[PDB]
């Protein structure tokens, strides 16, 4: 399961993830791929923010889904 995180800069972040993965692990791999501290990170899916505890299955985020990353 790969999902598309798109940033303000415009470059899209594609993440090889799994429905079992929690939000933090999604935030965790962003550190590796761009060096953005997770505190700054806050993911948005269809106008819904992502609580860190839940997993990708809780939000019905399926294959080839689009995520939004907003900083500050």
């Amino acid at each position: 399961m790969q999902i598309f995180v798109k940033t303000l800069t415009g470059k899209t972040i594609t993440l090889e993830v799994e429905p079992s993965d929690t939000i933090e692990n999604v935030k965790a791999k962003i550190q590796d791929k761009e060096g953005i501290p997770p505190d700054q990170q806050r993911l948005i899916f269809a106008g819904k923010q992502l609580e860190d505890g839940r997993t990708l299955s809780d939000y019905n985020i399926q294959k080839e889904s689009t995520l939004h990353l907003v900083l500050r």
Binding site: L8, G47, K48, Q49, H68, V70, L71
Partner: protein
């Protein structure tokens, strides 16, 4: 970020579906001065033809493309702020600390689906003739909304409720305020129904 535009043009990209619920586009078109008068008519009809939400889609679309005057974003936000729907003013603000905590956003999506699931119970039992007055005490209805609640009540009470529930779900922290309206009126049945106490 770097520039106010690309900040805003991207905040309507992320939160488009979250503000579509929250923006009442009929009154907010008043303050959008930068919009050419011919563009405004193109939206004032989409409100009439295809409802409010499919018009906000058109409105936010027609902003994400097309150059506009400098300071349009802060003009847009000040429209939302003083049109009585400040909830979308949190998301549209290029400033970030306004936007709500993810539990708050979640807690309300639950409070929203609760209405969309109990709406037939609400519609049959609620009387906007008497509940409207306390709804504007909690300031969860604007000056513009109450006109449309009072006018839509012309053809039946149920049309009033179906329009009231369409409005109050756009206000910040409405469920707790709405229950206070219901509890402090005769509708002690609905609060029993909404929260299952």
């Amino acid at each position: 970020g770097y520039s106010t535009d690309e900040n805003f043009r991207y905040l309507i990209s992320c939160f488009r579906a979250r503000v579509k619920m929250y923006i009442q586009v009929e009154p907010v078109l008043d303050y959008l001065t930068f919009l050419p008068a011919e563009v405004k008519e193109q939206i004032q009809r989409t409100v009439a033809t295809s409802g409010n939400m499919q018009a906000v889609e058109l409105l936010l679309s027609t902003l994400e493309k097309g150059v506009w005057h400098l300071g349009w974003t802060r003009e847009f936000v000040e429209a939302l702020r003083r049109t009585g729907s400040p909830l979308a003013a949190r998301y549209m603000n290029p400033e970030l600390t306004d936007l709500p905590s993810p539990s708050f956003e979640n807690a309300h999506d639950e409070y929203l689906q609760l209405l969309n699931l109990l709406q037939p119970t609400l519609v049959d039992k609620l009387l906007v003739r008497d509940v409207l007055d306390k709804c504007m005490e909690e300031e969860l209805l604007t000056i513009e909304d109450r006109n449309r609640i009072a006018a839509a009540e012309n053809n039946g009470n149920e049309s009033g409720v179906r329009e009231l529930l369409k409005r109050i779900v756009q206000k910040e922290n409405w469920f707790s305020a709405f229950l206070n309206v219901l509890r402090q009126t005769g509708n002690n049945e609905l609060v029993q129904e909404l929260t299952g106490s």
